[PDB]
Design a protein around this nucleic acid. Structure first.
Ligand SMILES: [Mg+2]
Ligand SMILES: [Mg+2]
Ligand SMILES: [Mg+2]
Ligand SMILES: [Mg+2]
Ligand SMILES: [Mg+2]
Ligand SMILES: [Mg+2]
Ligand SMILES: [Mg+2]
Ligand SMILES: [Mg+2]
Ligand SMILES: [Mg+2]
Ligand SMILES: [Mg+2]
Ligand SMILES: [Mg+2]
Ligand SMILES: [Mg+2]
Ligand SMILES: [Mg+2]
Ligand SMILES: [Mg+2]
Ligand SMILES: [Mg+2]
Ligand SMILES: [Mg+2]
Ligand SMILES: [Mg+2]
Ligand SMILES: [Mg+2]
Ligand SMILES: [Mg+2]
Ligand SMILES: [Mg+2]
Lengths: 62, 106, 119, 62
RNA sequence: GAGUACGGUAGAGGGUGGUGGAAUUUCCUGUGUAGCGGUGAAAUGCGUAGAUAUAGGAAGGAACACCAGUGGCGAAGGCGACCACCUGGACUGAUACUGACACUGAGGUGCGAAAGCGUGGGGAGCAAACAGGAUUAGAUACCCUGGUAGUCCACGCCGUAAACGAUGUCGACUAGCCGUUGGGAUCGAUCUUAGUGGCGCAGCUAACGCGAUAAGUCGACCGCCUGGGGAGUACGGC
């Protein structure tokens, strides 16, 4: 996210959010993706918030 | 006043008069000194899970500049309306006004 | 005693640390046949082995050939043994396994579980 | 965690692929964790010990 | 030194309401037939009055998977779903402002895990007491099947913990190396600031060990100790 822009990770960008979920539908640990801690926290909050609005699934099963 | 961002999705059966609800809400909140900055409609998407045993909903976004009174009355409208399903209000500090995701795909 | 045909069944394997239960149903969840490790005549330490699960799946499949069921989808659920031997018994019964899915229920916080055994 | 049998392969790669997918998801670990109740003292102690061992593992590489 | 005004950051800091998804339990209904559950092995227990399994629906309560980390915040106790509202402090940068306005602190005042107590609600799971089955020489235990106070909420009391870093608060100096959290400057690297960790020279220690987050070198104030039991007990007061 430090490459060009994006002052934060928004909950409306599903294309970026889907890069940080596993096929099950869980958040990917920061030690794998190499993301900074601050940006990982922003990922977590955005993913939960978008998961509320049914844009992302809580679980692959449902 | 104070900035707010509201995401609001309507039952698919009533997903034809959504213009009316948008207009009445906008009037009711800008008649008290409020303001509308962005009003986006990307409705009729598929749900990632079934809410009230439906799998479709009509999404809409609006950024508003309102006060406590307008907030409370709009929240009541969403609360006691039956074509509301789900709601999200996300106060922020800047007026965002230039597209969010629209339909990037063809 | 009356006849009814049905194609494309779903087989549920319910594996625990003590037993396994295999149940073949239609798409609507209507059970046609079932079998269990204890029903196969193992009854004890032998009940918690993949061999018992394989025999149970064999019996259930042979019962289910009555209705037809050229095709089975599979739902595995539970941590115990017999988790995979049941599926490889089911195919050898002759069905065409389209897919396998794990449906083990996981709480997100849930109720608190029992106290720990002091053994 | 789910798979499919696609393009006429034996029922010996699909089963192993399903096993690998389930291991990657973390099903047995989750069930073994909720098997009994772990009091917060024990949880915190385990996290501390694992962190110490992880740090020693990292340091011993050099 | 200590404070004020001004932008700006990160946070499970606190309080009041609203709402989510997974799972368990009970209840209603369809299919279906002889087992299910549990153990080291069993038995108690639940089933042909149709169980466990499986599919649909409804009610309710509590905890908040992944993110999650020698990570963060708080004086400590402690604080992990999401949103709005009310609110405390810390960090950071430039300029201006007051002009020693400071540190510690016997009495005193306030916050203070869990269990417990009072009044009124609630009741899914777990589970002191209790009942039954095992094991045993016995078994008022470990183990199994059940299960009530309690655990949850509001207000009030209680005032204790291996309440621990077993290390009082404040300030100043004393080789270095390797990580990490919030944030600035210079040209990914270097410098710098407040935290949080692993090693380590001097020095200190009975030794273990500490070692800029000192248990080293110093200063200001406070609390406490004086062989082991009897005993943190008796009597008196509060
Ligand atoms: Mg148990
Ligand atoms: Mg049932
Ligand atoms: Mg005092
Ligand atoms: Mg309590
Ligand atoms: Mg009590
Ligand atoms: Mg009592
Ligand atoms: Mg009561
Ligand atoms: Mg019980
Ligand atoms: Mg009480
Ligand atoms: Mg004490
Ligand atoms: Mg403590
Ligand atoms: Mg002490
Ligand atoms: Mg000291
Ligand atoms: Mg000092
Ligand atoms: Mg050291
Ligand atoms: Mg000493
Ligand atoms: Mg004495
Ligand atoms: Mg006394
Ligand atoms: Mg005492
Ligand atoms: Mg006395």
């Amino acid at each position: 996210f430090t490459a060009e822009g994006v002052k934060e990770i928004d909950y409306k960008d599903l294309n970026t959010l889907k890069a940080y979920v596993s096929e099950t539908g869980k958040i990917v640990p920061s030690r794998i993706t190499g993301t900074k801690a601050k940006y990982q926290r922003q990922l977590a909050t955005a993913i939960k918030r978008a998961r509320y609005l049914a844009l992302l699934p809580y679980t692959d099963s449902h | 006043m104070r900035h707010y961002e509201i995401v609001f999705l309507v039952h698919p059966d009533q997903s034809e008069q959504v213009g009316g609800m948008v207009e009445r809400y906008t009037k009711a909140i800008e008649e008290d000194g409020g303001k509308i900055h962005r009003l986006e409609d990307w409705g009729r998407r598929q749900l990632a899970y079934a809410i009230n045993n439906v799998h479709k909903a009509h999404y809409v976004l609006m950024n508003v500049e309102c006060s406590a009174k307008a907030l409370a009355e709009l929240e009541d409208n969403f609360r006691y309306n039956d074509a509301v399903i789900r709601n999200l209000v996300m106060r922020r500090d800047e007026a965002v006004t230039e597209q969010s995701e629209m339909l990037k795909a063809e | 005693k009356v006849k009814k045909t049905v194609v494309d069944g779903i087989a549920h394997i319910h594996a625990s640390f003590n037993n396994t239960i295999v149940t073949i149903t239609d798409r609507q969840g209507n059970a046609l046949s079932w079998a269990t490790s204890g029903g196969s005549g193992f009854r004890g330490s032998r009940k918690s082995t993949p061999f018992a699960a394989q025999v149970a799946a064999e019996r259930a499949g042979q019962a289910a050939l009555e209705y037809g069921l050229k095709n089975l989808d599979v739902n595995v659920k539970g941590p115990g043994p017999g988790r995979e031997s049941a599926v490889r018994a089911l195919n050898a019964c002759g069905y065409k396994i389209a897919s396998i899915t794990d449906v083990t229920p996981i709480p997100h916080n849930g109720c608190r579980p029992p106290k720990k055994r002091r053994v | 965690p789910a798979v499919k049998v696609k393009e006429n392969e034996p029922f010996d790669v699909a089963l192993r692929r399903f096993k690998r997918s389930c291991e990657k998801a973390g099903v047995l670990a989750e069930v073994r964790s909720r098997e009994f109740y772990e009091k917060p003292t024990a949880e915190r102690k385990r996290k501390a010990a694992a962190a110490v061992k992880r740090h020693a593992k990292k340091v011993q590489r050099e």
